[PDB]
Design a protein around this ligand. Sequence first.
Ligand SMILES: O=c1ccn([C@@H]2O[C@H](COP(=O)(O)OP(=O)(O)O[C@H]3O[C@H](CO)[C@H](O)[C@H](O)[C@H]3F)[C@@H](O)[C@H]2O)c(=O)[nH]1
Ligand SMILES: [Mn+2]
Length: 278
Amino acid sequence: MDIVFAADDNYAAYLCVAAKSVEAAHPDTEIRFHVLDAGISEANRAAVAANLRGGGGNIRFIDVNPEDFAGFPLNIRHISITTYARLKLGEYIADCDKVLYLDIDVLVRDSLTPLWDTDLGDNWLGASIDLFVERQEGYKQKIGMADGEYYFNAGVLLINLKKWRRHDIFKMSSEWVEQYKDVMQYQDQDILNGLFKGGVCYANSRFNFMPTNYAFMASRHTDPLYRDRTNTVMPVAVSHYCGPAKPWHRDCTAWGAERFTELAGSLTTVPEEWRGKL
Ligand SMILES: O=c1ccn([C@@H]2O[C@H](COP(=O)(O)OP(=O)(O)O[C@H]3O[C@H](CO)[C@H](O)[C@H](O)[C@H]3F)[C@@H](O)[C@H]2O)c(=O)[nH]1
Ligand SMILES: [Mn+2]
């Protein structure tokens, strides 16, 4: 399968751990990594690759200009401008009709094949629902969504790249931002939801298990589809540490954070400059 990550130099060490978590969960599946590189040093690219399978034979870094998204809001402190690079995925990747995009703060704990094998039809992408935002009274509607259109989290996206390449996603994104810049609270995540509402395939929350999903272990909608998708089917396949509390931080009470440390400790090569970060 084809996996996409996006990272600037600051997240290079975390990218490596996340990527290794994907390889570990797929011992007999070819994993082709495509990294939207917003400024990763040559040393860090070599180090990320040195730790992956075959010494990095299956990872390609794609240069992205962070200035491209200079006009987009960045109100969430722990998030850098690189978070918007995903918007030009159709411009950055030509060889794939479908790719599975993952945030850097994820820890894959089970096979992603069921998600990867999902037939997206003419939908724009497949994603898991964000319980936190969905229950934020009146927010969803502020960005033009209907009660029946579920707000998805942008941290795990099975993207119908072939469809994306038929459109100018960045231009559509820019126009949407112009329209909702004064109300959007979740940056790139809002853009994706606004542009694709009504054309989203929903995946089970096991593929994007966040703190709120853990805490839910009332129910916002009676809709059986909503309930089916938000009721996580064990085991968790993807741990997503959405929010300020990261597994590489101090006092991370987030569930499954220990797997991060175990993986970081298994690294083949660990640059002196990564010692602190990891
Ligand atoms: O120093 C940094 C910080 C962030 N990033 C990128 O930005 C993504 C954005 O943020 P987090 O993973 O930390 O975001 P968070 O999960 O907290 O937020 C929710 O809202 C975010 C809004 O901008 C994104 O859409 C994200 O995918 C979604 F899950 C990262 O995965 C990473 O690719 C970097 O490269 N370097
Ligand atoms: Mn994230």
